[PDB]
């Protein structure tokens, strides 16, 4: 069951690539904003993430986008909780290889 939960977590995380940070035009996964996805035996999911800055104005829109994307794209998910944390703090070092390449040019 711990391996089934892992596979569900992985599926949830991959679907978070459809959630974009509007200010950067890059998805939250490639930005490195998603710190943890965990799912219980009943497919209740907890997504722990941060924003690019405490100030970040799109925070409300990003969170509702997470719920819409997961509930729509992964219909077998049950609860969706998004916990926004500030520790450890985000930085650009957390971006993926593709994000770093894209943002060096865009």
CATH code for the domain in which residue 54 is found? 3.30.300.130
d(CA 77, CA 79): 7
List, in sequence order, every residue forming a beta bridge with 37; answer none if it has no partner. Answer: 47
Domain count, the chain: 1
- Dmax over Cα atoms in the chain, in whole Å? 43
Contact residues for 27 (Cβ-Cβ < 8 A; gap 6+)? 16, 17, 18, 19, 20, 21
- Domain with 6, as residue range(s), is 1-106
- Method of structure determination: X-ray
What resolution does the deposited structure have, in angstroms?
2.1
90 φ/ψ angles, rounded to the nearest 5 degrees: -60, 155
- Structural contact between residues 17 and 33, judged by C-beta atoms closer than 8 angstroms: no
3-class SS at 6? helix
3-class SS at 14? helix
Q: Which two tokens stand for residue 12?
A: 């949830």
- Structural contact between residues 49 and 33, judged by C-beta atoms closer than 8 angstroms: yes
């Amino acid at each position: 069951n711990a391996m089934s939960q892992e596979a569900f977590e992985n599926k949830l995380y991959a679907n978070l690539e459809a959630v974009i940070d509007p200010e950067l035009g890059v998805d939250i996964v490639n930005l490195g904003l998603v710190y943890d996805v965990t799912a219980d035996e009943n497919n209740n999911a907890v997504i722990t993430m941060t924003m690019t800055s405490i100030g970040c104005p799109m925070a409300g829109q990003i969170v509702s986008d997470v719920k819409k994307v997961l509930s729509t794209n992964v219909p077998e998910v049950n609860e969706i909780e998004v916990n926004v944390v500030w520790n450890p703090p985000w930085s650009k070092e957390r971006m993926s290889r593709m994000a770093k390449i894209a943002l060096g040019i865009r």
